[PDB]
Subunit: 172 residues, 2 copies
């Protein structure tokens, strides 16, 4: 059930104003948080993401994600951000230089290679460089904002990289 | 695992051109089809949807969904369309009169009432009327193309309907 979310390790969301309260609860695991954000149990809002305090074992169910306005994202090795994929835009806007979706299969069905891995191919596209371009796992991303759109390094030794078949919002 | 798809009962996809082949396989259940479209097993394309022939127990893995161009959708009581949610636009374009996402919680956390149900409230918004507006299950839809955007009939007897908190593609 935690599979239906997008984890951002050691990350927490912060916003700005006083008008915001954060529904929390002493939970047993991060799964409990998730199986309640999904089924929107006792919420007076629409849960789009939640943060799990690993040290206190507490959840903080939010009505927005790291992508909302005014929404910043703090650091902490005891926190874990989890965002409902239902609320992370799945289509591209242009060359999709701001794509944050979990797609990780190239236009022709080849699984992607982790950005934090140098096999099968070696590259310069590290998470430590393109910070903010979200080069997590093996997601389809576009660091340089190239024309092709989201792409990734193929796990097929015969293919360096390749574009990903991700829909335009103003499609075809 | 079939939960990570959007079923459209007794429906099949048809396209137009000759240049298209359809990967199929004699499968045991519709789950088998799904657990292979998801993990893109032996595909030379990106599976966005699949159709299960209940009578032949065969899958047809497609590289597009009912939303692609040239793509039509036939009828048959032995067929079942299943579309990867990853490829069904989750954001709104305007008043979102063409929204086909699986969201079904109102802006304030109230679960939605099935369009094919007359409880708690009675209405005229039937699937038989607004055909093409996809008034399936209890999804957030906008039949009349109103200003508010996607909405639905609340399951709370105290609330007739209410808007759903669904993101704009050119958000905020």
């Amino acid at each position: 059930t935690l599979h239906e979310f997008k984890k951002s390790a050691k990350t927490t969301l912060t916003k700005e104003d006083p008008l915001l309260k954060i529904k929390t609860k002493k939970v047993n695991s991060a799964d409990e948080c998730a199986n309640r954000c999904i089924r929107n149990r006792g919420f007076t809002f629409t849960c789009k993401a939640f943060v799990f305090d690993k040290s206190r074992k507490r959840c903080y169910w939010y009505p927005f994600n790291s992508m909302s306005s005014g929404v910043k994202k703090g650091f902490g090795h005891e926190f874990d951000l989890y965002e409902n994929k239902d609320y992370i835009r799945n289509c591209i806007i242009g060359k999709g230089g701001s794509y944050k979706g979990t797609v990780s299969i190239t236009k022709s069905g080849i699984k992607c290679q982790p950005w934090n891995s140098m096999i099968p191919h070696e590259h310069s596209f590290l998470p430590s460089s393109y910070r903010g371009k979200d080069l997590q796992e093996n997601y389809c991303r576009n660091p340089r904002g190239e024309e092709g759109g989201p792409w990734c390094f193929t796990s097929n030794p015969e293919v360096r990289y390749e574009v990903c078949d991700i829909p335009q919002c103003s499609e075809v």
